Amino acid sequence: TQFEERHLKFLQQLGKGGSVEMCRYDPLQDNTGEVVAVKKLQHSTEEHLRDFEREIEILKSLQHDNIVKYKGVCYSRNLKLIMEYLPYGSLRDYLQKHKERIDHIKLLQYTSQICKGMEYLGTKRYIHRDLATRNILVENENRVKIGDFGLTKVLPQDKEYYKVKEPGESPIFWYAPESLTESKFSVASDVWSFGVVLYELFTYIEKSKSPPAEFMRMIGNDKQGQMIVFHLIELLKNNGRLPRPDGCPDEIYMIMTECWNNNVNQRPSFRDLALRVDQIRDNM
Ligand SMILES: O=C1Nc2ccccc2-c2ccnc3[nH]cc(c23)[C@@H]1c1ccc(O)cc1
Ligand code: NA
């Protein structure tokens, strides 16, 4: 069933980078309609349209408790992607506001759910590419979901990585070394980014400890532009890593270091991450 553009009412702009708005779908014109999240393109080049339609088919083929829900598309191309609205916003903002009132056991609940959504995504041969707490959404106290599939690629049939020929804006401080050097993305590079997510969680989003702040201090704050990427590559090749966060249990920190292995084949799988984190949880 269809969404008519005429009945989509604007409420609030939520974020940009396309843009995401809060709308009410109100066919009845008496404001009783469902509140939804709407993504639309702000600069609608032919390349971007075709990227956006691929994003739409990716989100639509996904159905999992820990993946943001597709609801439909509104036509008039200038497509709008209609999705569920998650009112607690991104995990990053949520953790920031509610800091250490979220205990380690709760952090591990979210980490488990992140690994399950990621493992399900991999069974369809999708590489998220932008796994980070700002792209995880909170449905309620007991559930998060993976969002913004903006950067997601499908693996070729005959290959286990996808090579991005002309990169756009890239979250380098979450990127595996092979992604930095050769622009190669794989299930294993998602696992590397997951390690950085787990770091984010255990720092409680303290600004002076964010991945960009720490890596910049390690390479020196005088590095600029593409010299940053050059020094970050050398640093990672020589075992420079993010530190253990204040108060982080030793075993969760081991998992982070394991995901940050230079050797792609030695990084753990999301299936084994979810098993291990559920084991830590039960122990606690
Ligand atoms: O994950 C999203 N994050 C953002 C980013 C910026 C502004 C708002 C949101 C957001 C906020 C609240 N509910 C949402 N549902 C889906 C999205 C979203 C979002 C969304 C966008 C594209 C997509 O493929 C899947 C989800
Ligand atoms: Na609109």
CB 127, CB 149: distance < 8 Å: no
Q: Which residues contact 258 (CB under 8 A, 6 or more apart)?
A: 195, 266, 267, 268
Separation CA 140–CA 206 (nearest Å): 22
Separation CA 121–CA 115 (nearest Å): 10
Q: How was this structure determined?
A: X-ray
CA neighbor of 117 nearest in space, from 197, 21, 39: 197
Question: Which residues are found with C-beta within 5 Å of the ion, ligand 2?
Answer: 8
What residues flank ligand 1, with Cβ below 6 Å?
14-15, 20, 37, 39, 55, 59, 68, 83-86, 89, 135, 137, 147-150
**Cα-based distances in Å from 121 to 28, 104, 112, 124:** 36, 26, 14, 6
Point out the ligand nearest to the CA of residue 19.
Answer: 1
CA 246 to chain centre: 24
Separation CA 253–CA 202 (nearest Å): 9
CB 245, CB 224: distance < 8 Å: no
Walk me through the domains of the chain, giving residue ranges and CATH numbers: 1-85 (3.30.200.20), 86-282 (1.10.510.10)
Q: Say whether 16 counts as a known binding-site residue.
A: yes
Separation CA 185–CA 127 (nearest Å): 7
Separation CA 5–CA 30 (nearest Å): 16
Given in angstroms, what resolution was this structure solved at?
Answer: 2.1
CB 14, CB 20: distance < 8 Å: yes
Q: Which residues contact 10 (CB under 8 A, 6 or more apart)?
A: 21, 23
Query: 35 - beta bridge partners?
Result: 24
Separation CA 251–CA 233 (nearest Å): 27
**Catalytic, out of 130, 148, 158, 246:** 130
Reply yes or no on whether 148 is catalytic: no
